[PDB]
Design a binder for this molecule. Sequence first.
Ligand SMILES: *[C@@H]1O[C@H](CO)[C@@H](O)[C@H](O)[C@H]1NC(C)=O
Lengths: 42, 258
Amino acid sequence: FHTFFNEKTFGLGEADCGLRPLFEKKSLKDTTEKELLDSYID
Amino acid sequence: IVEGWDAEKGIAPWQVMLFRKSPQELLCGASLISDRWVLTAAHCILYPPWDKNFTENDLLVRIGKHSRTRYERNVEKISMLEKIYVHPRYNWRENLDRDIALLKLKKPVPFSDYIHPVCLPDKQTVTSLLRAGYKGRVTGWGNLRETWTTNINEIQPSVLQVVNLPIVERPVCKASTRIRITDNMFCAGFKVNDTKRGDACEGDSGGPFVMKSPFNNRWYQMGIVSAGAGCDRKGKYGFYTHVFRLKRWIQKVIDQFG
Ligand SMILES: *[C@@H]1O[C@H](CO)[C@@H](O)[C@H](O)[C@H]1NC(C)=O
């Protein structure tokens, strides 16, 4: 993940953003992610 | 949020509740982009016509929540604001163009299984995901339906709501409203038929419109709920602040700290 901000001004969190602890981190998928990924057709 | 469903715990760890101090009341939705910065809509902070002109002291934010009312001890965190930055070109007297605001927290919020920032998009993410037909997700605590159509306690959700919405063709929404849709916004919603059409409501304003990248598995906030067409508002599609187009401004503010 290519970082964009500086943590001295932006605070912590950017490097690990968007990855949910109870989902992506546990290899678990939420109830409807499917609907979203299924719509990103070429 | 209309025609949506209850949120699973931690499904949107970046969801933020913009609260009013006194009287205590949920005001808008918002999102966590870092442990010190929060994104929400400008009309949520400043909009004289609905008697809204708040300042750092007037409100606070609740993070890590699920329940709309019940205090969730050892999970939610309350934070005072240090400063509010509403886009200088936001003009409440004209339209919703550049309807965006950055909120700085007084104290960094500690992360947990229920508190985690969402990602801001890059040009690459926008060109691959922000396109008509692709679906995104909106979360919030706004009303479930039109007011007056039943007891209020039955239209205000008890738990956070979620709904998936398709991005609408720009020409198609420009033709559905007399409101101007600038290049700094995009529309989302189901077609005029699909009977039970999901959407965001007033209490959802300021909330995030997210999309999950099939390329790196991360969630990106593509938009900020500016004007949902759900509940009491006239209209077919919701308007969203095109977050990427305002990224430079976000950076300018953060670099300098406003
Ligand atoms: C907001 O209220 C302040 C503080 O009283 C006042 O100076 C300002 O005119 C108000 N904002 C607008 C644009 O109405």
